Design a protein around this ligand. Structure first.
Ligand SMILES: CN1c2c(nc(N)[nH]c2=O)NC[C@@H]1CNc1ccc(C(=O)N[C@@H](CCC(=O)O)C(=O)O)cc1
Ligand SMILES: OC[C@@H](O)[C@@H](O)CO
Ligand SMILES: [Zn+2]
Length: 734
């Protein structure tokens, strides 16, 4: 007998029923009851999928917005500003709206959670959702195992006084009070018959201190009386010996995303006092695996229980109706529903119930020898611009003849319902491409004119033809495929359909040329080329595992570089390469950062390798540059724009203190996440802070980020004040 486990199965339903229900409720289209009944169908849909494939069925997985927020509600972490928790009404105020909690990335994944704000040092059992959901399935005669966020990881994901609660001294006191509530929750589940509880402590995979592990042993020592199974994933655990020594009867490890866990089990063994749960089915990638090989690994591991490596909610629900993918691909793929089915076949195999497992051995599958070699043979000169910055700067400044404190925008412009509708019609064939492109050139023509009237120095074409900064390029790249229903939960009710890099990436034809070229031909001021970095394109989509990441990134980098060259040949003087994944795709363990940035930097520069006369701009959304400034300094851009409105310029600190800094900085002086219009006096404060040490010739004035989420009547005013501020500054220093 091989006990099979599974967790994180998508909650969105096969037709985004979850999305429709959430939004129907917020609109007031359905009652809270109808909403609840809709959620209950999803519960049954999820539970029946588990029932048909694994032995342990999870409960408490259908979060109405976020499971970390759910955890916060359970332990009473509800900030004073929300008043008395009334229920769903209060819950959704914490999740969305003007008083909502902060939203941030859940580890190195594309899912986003809500950061709890701990205002009091004492926790209490406010609502026992684990017990609720448990009983619900019990009504249906289904025994389930509550899925919960462990106490350590909960605190690790939360903030106090706006700061991470990640230091042992910061957690100690809190942990004692907190564990108490978990103790109540667990004691109530066991009283009602709960036989097993799934605890998630993914934070165990972060670069922890021996001091953290003393705390962890402490916490779980107080919970040893309960039937707990601990899960860890996304990377190897920071201290193997300490972790397997925890007083828990069963431990789960991620044996897919890292090779460290295996080597440690091989070196130190595994305690015969507990049971190993081998997470051997990838939960972040969509590929079929040779189950024969996975089977031998399980035997090697000595485990008698299996499961997916990490949560399955990073994958689409099912591959069943994906019948329009490139030839041969579908046979190599496998989504959430298929992974579940993979654990069943693995279970039957190991138990000797079946002696036949599928082939799955794609190797020479969709490969372009010419392009693969064309990348592997790249000379050192491929990652370095012909001339150092100082020289490129003079050439560029003479070619652009820009005034002091020039102004510009980061990229996307608001897309009124009219352009939003037109894209729909086009997508549905309700319009002719010939007429669609004509509609775009119309929005572009209008945008260019509006920018000149306002007084901007460097213009952008608006990006009206782009919905997603990755999807747009992914759809024009060979070796990449797009699904029809592969929706993955990004956060709340927002879903993304990540592309699939299944083969050697190459760019068969110009991707943005017509739009840029057109916009430039409407004015004499410079218009920015708009490109997405290689790492970001890769990071937002799924990709082949049988080859090193860096290779795939370099392949995409090549494609992007060819585009940069076409832009130069076509006369574009400024090209921007937005690489938000630069820091987001970095390993969870900062200790593994040096290796990663080595090839991330290379990938960016290979793509950004433009002629010296071409000014390269790079936009970084990050709120702090202290921990990556050393890596950023190796990127060969000529201008970097940051978001300085929130910190009111204080974010420039990382740059001031970086001895030798000399590149231009686009100072974001307007928080585009707010509808308000910042005053000239407000933007001025920011620009004055940045001019405290850095030479005034380095400064560019621009908005924090893209404007696609704003309204034209908020943009115009703001842009106008921005230009005005530019003129005032330019008169005080010239
Ligand atoms: C991978 N994501 C990502 C990112 N930005 C960063 N920095 N990192 C990321 O990982 N931007 C896109 C996406 C997360 N953000 C979003 C934002 C909105 C929607 C959204 O509203 N999606 C629509 C469908 C949009 C369409 O028509 O394609 C939805 O209702 O699901 C999805 C994801
Ligand atoms: O080390 C991972 C941490 O920085 C966060 O991304 C966890 O969500
Ligand atoms: Zn940004």
């Amino acid at each position: 007998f091989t006990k099979a486990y599974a967790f994180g199965f998508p909650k969105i339903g096969e037709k985004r029923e979850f999305k429709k229900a959430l939004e129907d409720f917020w609109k007031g289209k359905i009652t809270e009851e109808q909403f609840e009944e809709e959620m209950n169908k999803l519960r049954m849909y999820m539970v029946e999928n588990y029932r048909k494939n694994v032995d342990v069925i999870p409960s408490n997985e259908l979060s109405y917005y976020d499971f970390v927020l759910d955890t916060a509600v359970m332990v009473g972490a509800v900030p004073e500003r929300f008043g008395e928790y009334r229920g769903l009404s209060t819950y959704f105020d914490m999740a969305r709206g003007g008083k909502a909690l902060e939203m941030t990335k859940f580890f190195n994944t594309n899912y986003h959670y809500l950061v709890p704000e701990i205002e009091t040092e004492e926790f209490y059992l406010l609502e026992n959702k684990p017990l609720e959901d448990y009983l619900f399935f019990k009504s249906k005669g289904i025994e389930t195992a509550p899925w919960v966020i462990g106490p350590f990881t909960f605190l690790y994901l939360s903030k106090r006084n706006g700061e991470w609660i990640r230091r042992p001294n910061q957690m100690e006191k809190l942990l004692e009070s907190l564990v108490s509530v978990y103790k109540e929750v667990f004691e109530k589940l066991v009283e009602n018959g709960c036989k097993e509880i799934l605890v998630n402590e993914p934070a165990f995979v972060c670069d922890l201190e021996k001091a953290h592990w003393d705390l962890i042993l402490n916490v779980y020592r107080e919970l040893s009386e309960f039937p707990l199974t601990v899960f860890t994933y996304y990377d190897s655990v920071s201290d193997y010996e300490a972790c397997v020594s925890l007083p828990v009867k069963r431990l789960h490890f991620d044996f897919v995303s890292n090779e460290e866990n295996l080597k440690n089990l091989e070196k130190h063994g595994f305690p015969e006092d507990k049971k190993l749960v081998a997470g051997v089915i990838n939960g972040r990638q969509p590929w079929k695996v040779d189950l024969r090989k996975v089977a031998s690994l399980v035997e090697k591991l000595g485990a008698s229980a299996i499961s997916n490596s990490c949560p399955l909610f990073h994958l689409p629900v099912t591959l069943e109706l994906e019948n329009n993918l490139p030839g041969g691909l579908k046979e190599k793929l496998a989504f959430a529903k298929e992974k579940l089915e993979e654990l069943k076949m693995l279970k039957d195999f190991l138990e000797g119930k079946t002696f036949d497992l599928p082939n799955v051995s794609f190797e020479d599958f969709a490969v372009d020898l010419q392009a693969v070699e064309r990348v592997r043979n790249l000379p050192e000169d491929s990652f370095r611009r012909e001339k150092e910055y100082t020289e490129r700067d003079r050439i560029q400044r003479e070619r652009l003849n820009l005034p002091l404190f020039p102004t510009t925008t980061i990229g996307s412009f608001p897309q009124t319902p009219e352009v939003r509708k037109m894209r729909s019609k086009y997508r549905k064939g309700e319009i002719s491409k010939e007429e669609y492109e004509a509609f775009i050139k119309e929005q572009i023509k209008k945008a260019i004119e509006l920018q000149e009237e306002i007084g901007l120095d460097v213009l952008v074409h608006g990006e009206f033809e782009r919905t997603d900064m990755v999807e747009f390029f992914a759809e024009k790249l060979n070796g990449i495929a797009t699904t029809q229903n592969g929706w993955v939960l990004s956060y709340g009710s927002r879903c993304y359909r990540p592309p699939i890099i299944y083969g050697t990436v190459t760019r068969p034809e110009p991707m943005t040329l017509k739009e840029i070229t057109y916009a430039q031909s409407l004015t004499e001021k410079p218009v920015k080329g708009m490109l997405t970095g290689p790492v970001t394109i890769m990071s937002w989509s799924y990709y082949r595992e049988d080859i090193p990441e860096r290779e795939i990134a370099y392949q995409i980098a090549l494609a992007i570089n060819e585009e940069v060259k076409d832009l130069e040949e076509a006369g574009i003087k400024i090209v921007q390469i937005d690489e938000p994944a630069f820091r987001e795709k970095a390993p969870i363990k900062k200790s593994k950062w040096p290796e990663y940035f080595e090839w991330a930097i290379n990938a960016f520069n290979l793509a950004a390798n433009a002629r010296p006369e071409t000014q390269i701009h790079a936009h970084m959304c990050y709120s702090d540059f202290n921990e990556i400034i050393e890596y950023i300094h190796q990127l060969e851009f000529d201008v970097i724009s940051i978001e300085a409105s929130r910190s009111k310029g204080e974010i420039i600190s990382a740059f001031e203190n970086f001895k030798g800094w000399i590149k231009q900085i686009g100072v974001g002086v307007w928080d585009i996440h707010s509808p308000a219009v910042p005053s000239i006096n407000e933007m001025r404060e920011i620009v004055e802070r940045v001019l405290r040490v850095l030479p005034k010739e380095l400064i560019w004035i621009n908005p924090d980020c893209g404007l696609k989420t704003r309204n034209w009547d908020e943009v115009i005013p703001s842009l106008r004040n921005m230009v005005a501020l530019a003129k005032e500054m330019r008169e005080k220093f010239a």
